[PDB]
Amino acid sequence: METYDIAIIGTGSGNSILDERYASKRAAICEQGTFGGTCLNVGCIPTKMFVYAAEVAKTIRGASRYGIDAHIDRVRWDDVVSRVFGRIDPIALSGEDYRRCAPNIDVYRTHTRFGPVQADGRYLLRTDAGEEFTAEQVVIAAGSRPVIPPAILASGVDYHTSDTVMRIAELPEHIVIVGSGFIAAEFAHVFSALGVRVTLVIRGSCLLRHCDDTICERFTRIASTKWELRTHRNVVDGQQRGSGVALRLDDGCTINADLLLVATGRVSNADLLDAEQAGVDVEDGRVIVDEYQRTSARGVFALGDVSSPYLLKHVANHEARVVQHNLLCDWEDTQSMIVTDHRYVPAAVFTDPQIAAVGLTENQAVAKGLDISVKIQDYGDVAYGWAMEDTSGIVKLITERGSGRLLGAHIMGYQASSLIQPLIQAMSFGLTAAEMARGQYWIHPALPEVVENALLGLR
Amino acid sequence: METYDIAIIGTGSGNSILDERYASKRAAICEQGTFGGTCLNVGCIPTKMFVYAAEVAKTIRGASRYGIDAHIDRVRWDDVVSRVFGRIDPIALSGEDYRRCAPNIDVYRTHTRFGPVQADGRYLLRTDAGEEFTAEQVVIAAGSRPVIPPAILASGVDYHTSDTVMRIAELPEHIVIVGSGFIAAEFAHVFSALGVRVTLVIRGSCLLRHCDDTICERFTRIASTKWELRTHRNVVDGQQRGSGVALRLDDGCTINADLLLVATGRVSNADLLDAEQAGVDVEDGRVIVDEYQRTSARGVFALGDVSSPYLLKHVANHEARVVQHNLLCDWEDTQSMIVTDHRYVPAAVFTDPQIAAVGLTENQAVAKGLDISVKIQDYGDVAYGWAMEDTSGIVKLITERGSGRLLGAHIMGYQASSLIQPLIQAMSFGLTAAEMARGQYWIHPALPEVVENALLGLR
Ligand SMILES: Cc1cc2nc3c(=O)[nH]c(=O)nc-3n(C[C@H](O)[C@H](O)[C@H](O)COP(=O)(O)OP(=O)(O)OC[C@H]3O[C@@H](n4cnc5c(N)ncnc54)[C@H](O)[C@@H]3O)c2cc1C
Numbered sequence: 079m080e081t082y083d084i085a086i087i088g089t090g091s092g093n094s095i096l097d098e099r100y101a102s103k104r105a106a107i108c109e110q111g112t113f114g115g116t117c118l119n120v121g122c123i124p125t126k127m128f129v130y131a132a133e134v135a136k137t138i139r140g141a142s143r144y145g146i147d148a149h150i151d152r153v154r155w156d157d158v159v160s161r162v163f164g165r166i167d168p169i170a171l172s173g174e175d176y177r178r179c180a181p182n183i184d185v186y187r188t189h190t191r192f193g194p195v196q197a198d199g200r201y202l203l204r205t206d207a208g209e210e211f212t213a214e215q216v217v218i219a220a221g222s223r224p225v226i227p228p229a230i231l232a233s234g235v236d237y238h239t240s241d242t243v244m245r246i247a248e249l250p251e252h253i254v255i256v257g258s259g260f261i262a263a264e265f266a267h268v269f270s271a272l273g274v275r276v277t278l279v280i281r282g283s284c285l286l287r288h289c290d291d292t293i294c295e296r297f298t299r300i301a302s303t304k305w306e307l308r309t310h311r312n313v314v315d316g317q318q319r320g321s322g323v324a325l326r327l328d329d330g331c332t333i334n335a336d337l338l339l340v341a342t343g344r345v346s347n348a349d350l351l352d353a354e355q356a357g358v359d360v361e362d363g364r365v366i367v368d369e370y371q372r373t374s375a376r377g378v379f380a381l382g383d384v385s386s387p388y389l390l391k392h393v394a395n396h397e398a399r400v401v402q403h404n405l406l407c408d409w410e411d412t413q414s415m416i417v418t419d420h421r422y423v424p425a426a427v428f429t430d431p432q433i434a435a436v437g438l439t440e441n442q443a444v445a446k447g448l449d450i451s452v453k454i455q456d457y458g459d460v461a462y463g464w465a466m467e468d469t470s471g472i473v474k475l476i477t478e479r480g481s482g483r484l485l486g487a488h489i490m491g492y493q494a495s496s497l498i499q500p501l502i503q504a505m506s507f508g509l510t511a512a513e514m515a516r517g518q519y520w521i522h523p524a525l526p527e528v529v530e531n532a533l534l535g536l537r
Numbered sequence: 538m539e540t541y542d543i544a545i546i547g548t549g550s551g552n553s554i555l556d557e558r559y560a561s562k563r564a565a566i567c568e569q570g571t572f573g574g575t576c577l578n579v580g581c582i583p584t585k586m587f588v589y590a591a592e593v594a595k596t597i598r599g600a601s602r603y604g605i606d607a608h609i610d611r612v613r614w615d616d617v618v619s620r621v622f623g624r625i626d627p628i629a630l631s632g633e634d635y636r637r638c639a640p641n642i643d644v645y646r647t648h649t650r651f652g653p654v655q656a657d658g659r660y661l662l663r664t665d666a667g668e669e670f671t672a673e674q675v676v677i678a679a680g681s682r683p684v685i686p687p688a689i690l691a692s693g694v695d696y697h698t699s700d701t702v703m704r705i706a707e708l709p710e711h712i713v714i715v716g717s718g719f720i721a722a723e724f725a726h727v728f729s730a731l732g733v734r735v736t737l738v739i740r741g742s743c744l745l746r747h748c749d750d751t752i753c754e755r756f757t758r759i760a761s762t763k764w765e766l767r768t769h770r771n772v773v774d775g776q777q778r779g780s781g782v783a784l785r786l787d788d789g790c791t792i793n794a795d796l797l798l799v800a801t802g803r804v805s806n807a808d809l810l811d812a813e814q815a816g817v818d819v820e821d822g823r824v825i826v827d828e829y830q831r832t833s834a835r836g837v838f839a840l841g842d843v844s845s846p847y848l849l850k851h852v853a854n855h856e857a858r859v860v861q862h863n864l865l866c867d868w869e870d871t872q873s874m875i876v877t878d879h880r881y882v883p884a885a886v887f888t889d890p891q892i893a894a895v896g897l898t899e900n901q902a903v904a905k906g907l908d909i910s911v912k913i914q915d916y917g918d919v920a921y922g923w924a925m926e927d928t929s930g931i932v933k934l935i936t937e938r939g940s941g942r943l944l945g946a947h948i949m950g951y952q953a954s955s956l957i958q959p960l961i962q963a964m965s966f967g968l969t970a971a972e973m974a975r976g977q978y979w980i981h982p983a984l985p986e987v988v989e990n991a992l993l994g995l996r
């Protein structure tokens with residue numbers, strides 16, 4: 079049997095752990111899927127590449143509004159996929175060879191499970207290929223996996239997820255997307271801009287429900303005009319109709335479509351770990367971690383979607399930085415460790431219009447009994463919005479009336495993820511709204527003026 | 538003669554002075570040109586509207602690179618001008634009626650000059666229409682005016698400036714722009730994107746020279762490939778060629794063109810005031826003001842291009858806010874006034890690629906003997922740059938090695954004026970580079986990751 083000093087399960091954010099501090103130790107890496115993780119191969123990086131291609135097509139269609147008559151001749155979807163994955167797929171191989179060729183790091187490419195803890199304190203790990211090894215410290219970065227509704231699974235129909243829809247041969251004529259999350263909204267923007275008829279079948283009343291109701295209500299109204307929105311509906315059955323699909327809904331109506339995309343959420347991969355056999359406690363479906371990313375087992379850390387409540391890459395990277403430091407630091411030296419901070423976490427949804435938010439919502443501050451001041455500023459009231467002829471873009475700020483500090487920031491409009499950054503800086507470092515408005519300069523007539531005027535308007 | 542409490546010369550930024558605190562005094566407004574000023578009618582607002590229209594056309598032309606085959610059918614230049622100025626021109630009428638119809642405000646629409654000071658100490662003002670009146674307090678906001686080379690004026694050739702070139706009937710086939718400032722660079726981007734052949738005749742060696750040399754050198758190289766750049770050349774003579782022009786250069790070569798655009802700089806309007814007859818001192822060609830915007834004459838303030846060294850609207854509005862407060866404040870109570878802030882002034886040039894900068898450049902910090910750290914981060918190294926397939930976007934940061942604070946920030950690329958705002962906030966409030974990188978969250982995979990990596994790369 080082989081002995082290792084540290085074993086990491088998952089090459090997502092856990093790949094960024096073995097640095098030069100581990101040059102004298104023997105490490106083992108486990109990756110049941112493709113090297114690199116989810117974000118690179120089938121996640122954030124390839125999706126936003128398709129989004130920018132969609133944003134190019136959206137500009138051409140609405141060019142007539144500005145005085146330029148243009149039209150799209152062809153959408154070479156085959157070359158778009160080749161351009162996207164021609165950059166990503168070779169990256170996964172280079173990173174895989176960089177770790178495998180290292181003499182002190184050994185890579186296992188099968189599903190690894192937890193075994194009973196050995197007498198000496200070392201953790202036994204077993205792979206689905208039949209490999210057994212031990213490690214003093216163990217890092218859990220198993221991530222998450224998609225969830226498919228049981229009614230869709232029991233139907234036996236051909237469906238697609240975010241993991242497989244990005245490598246399709248030809249663009250369909252009509253697609254049905256089941257879901258209302260950030261994945262479902264971004265894909266609706268991609269296919270619609272490329273010329274596909276999009277139909278959203280959501281079970282709730284608003285798209286992107288966990289956003290502020292002001293944003294969700296305005297965006298759901300705008301989205302309902304460009305896409306076919308079926309609210310309060312659930313898919314109960316379906317059958318093949320050739321290359322397409324025929325799905326029956328909970329109200330008796332049936333929908334014919336060429337492709338079915340399931341985006342009903344994701345849950346952690348902790349259930350396929352046998353963590354109970356090693357002393358790691360699991361609640362709901364996630365791994366229990368503390369402020370030092372320490373689990374209920376001595377020497378075992380965890381990070382990423384497998385434990386964190388935020389399924390975001392910028393959060394998983396902050397937890398990977400905590401694991402890197404709190405590792406080499408004795409298990410009980412909590413004064414010499416670093417605490418993971420989750421205060422003011424931002425998020426963005428790359429749709430049309432783009433949405434980006436950070437902090438509490440208006441109703442969330444009300445539920446906490448805070449005396450708040452709210453201002454909603456439109457893009458069309460700023461000089462840059464005049465050049466854009468914008469008629470829907472907004473930026474919403476919530477501040478505590480007493481302290482004058484920012485409580486929440488919700489933007490829905492052009493360059494939402496970029497204009498939200500100066501607002502993230504004020505919240506993270508404790509800058510009051512009055513200081514952000516008049517304490518610095520804003521270039522005229524740049525776009526961030528809509529954030530400046532929103533602060534001035536906070537009556 | 539008419540008695541007034543306050544008289545303001547210039548309805549540009551000076552219009553934002555008359556508040557409800559003066560709702561009982563008799564005020565006089567002077568506007569020799571069109572109401573609203575330079576920025577709205579013939580400046581920033583209409584120019585940046587044409588820029589966005591040009592940026593839309595630029596996206597369609599290079600759309601094939603991303604997999605979308607498109608082409609521009611027609612450029613309705615007449616509808617672009619009508620859409621822009623159909624929105625701007627009525628604003629000048631509404632703002633003009635808003636002041637004239639007020640019983641306490643009287644509007645004079647001719648050029649106003651300074652007269653000899655009256656015996657009682659009040660300032661006499663005379664307009665070119667024959668109106669004489671007096672005022673207790675005077676605000677000078679005369680702005681600036683374009684500068685035309687003497688060789689072009691003595692030639693008798695038909696030339697255009699930023700005040701007149703935007704309302705042309707039909708787009709020319711070939712245009713020549715004489716100048717290297719921010720005005721000349723933005724207009725070269727506008728006409729080139731709309732299909733005009735652009736030829737730059739600059740007197741120096743680099744385009745946008747007063748910017749960081751790293752930016753100027755890279756931008757001048759890019760501009761030389763899409764536009765015809767003739768460096769170290771000056772127009773010495775010219776003659777009409779029909780609807781076009783034939784210009785003679787300082788090296789004997791002649792250029793035939795359809796339109797001539799002059800962007801060789803601007804000069805303050807203080808020289809056309811007879812200001813020495815009222816006791817207000819003039820240096821160079823601008824009015825001398827102190828840190829409280831006070832001139833050398835008791836009761837006389839000044840703001841805008843007529844005095845400030847920075848010819849920017851966001852600076853002229855900050856100076857108008859200081860005048861508005863220190864006006865209503867006793868002339869000798871300097872302890873109860875507000876100081877004009879010129880510490881971290883930003884600027885942007887809306888060209889292709891877009892440029893935005895704030896603070897000192899690398900060569901400026903060297904001349905001051907500061908131990909600095911410099912990092913140049915490429916757009917192509919961030920996840921958003923992959924979706925953009927960017928190959929030229931950069932962000933340059935200069936920090937003091939000792940204090941660790943930001944000394945300068947120079948960006949050349951997509952969303953330059955928007956990406957620089959979080960950097961302006963850190964400099965204006967005293968945030969260190971290490972705090973900006975790891976003290977807050979950056980949305981993945983948003984564009985501001987290039988600013989985060991530029992801070993992380995500093996060593
Ligand atoms: C379509 C899509 C778009 C997204 N867009 C964004 C976005 O814009 N911004 C953002 O912040 N986040 C985004 N995310 C979320 C982001 O991708 C994840 O939150 C992030 O990848 C989680 O990192 P991780 O390393 O914990 O998970 P992963 O990167 O998935 O790491 C888990 C890896 O380990 C493997 N593994 C699991 N269990 C085992 C085992 N027992 N043995 C061996 N190997 C195992 C898995 O196969 C996988 O390769 C998106 C996700 C999706 C699906």
Ligand SMILES: Cc1cc2nc3c(=O)[nH]c(=O)nc-3n(C[C@H](O)[C@H](O)[C@H](O)COP(=O)(O)OP(=O)(O)OC[C@H]3O[C@@H](n4cnc5c(N)ncnc54)[C@H](O)[C@@H]3O)c2cc1C
Pocket residue numbers: 521522523546547548549550551567568569570571573574575576579580581584647648649650678679680681699720806809810840841842843847848849850851852853
């Ligand atoms: C093409 C162009 C683009 C620009 N783009 C930008 C940009 O993107 N960002 C930016 O920050 N700045 C920009 N500027 C600069 C900006 O326009 C000025 O810095 C700002 O408008 C200064 O305001 P002001 O009120 O002092 O000048 P003005 O707005 O010109 O005010 C002066 C007004 O008073 C009148 N006047 C002058 N003298 C007299 C007199 N004796 N009697 C009566 N009336 C008089 C003038 O005719 C004029 O109408 C640009 C300028 C130009 C020309």
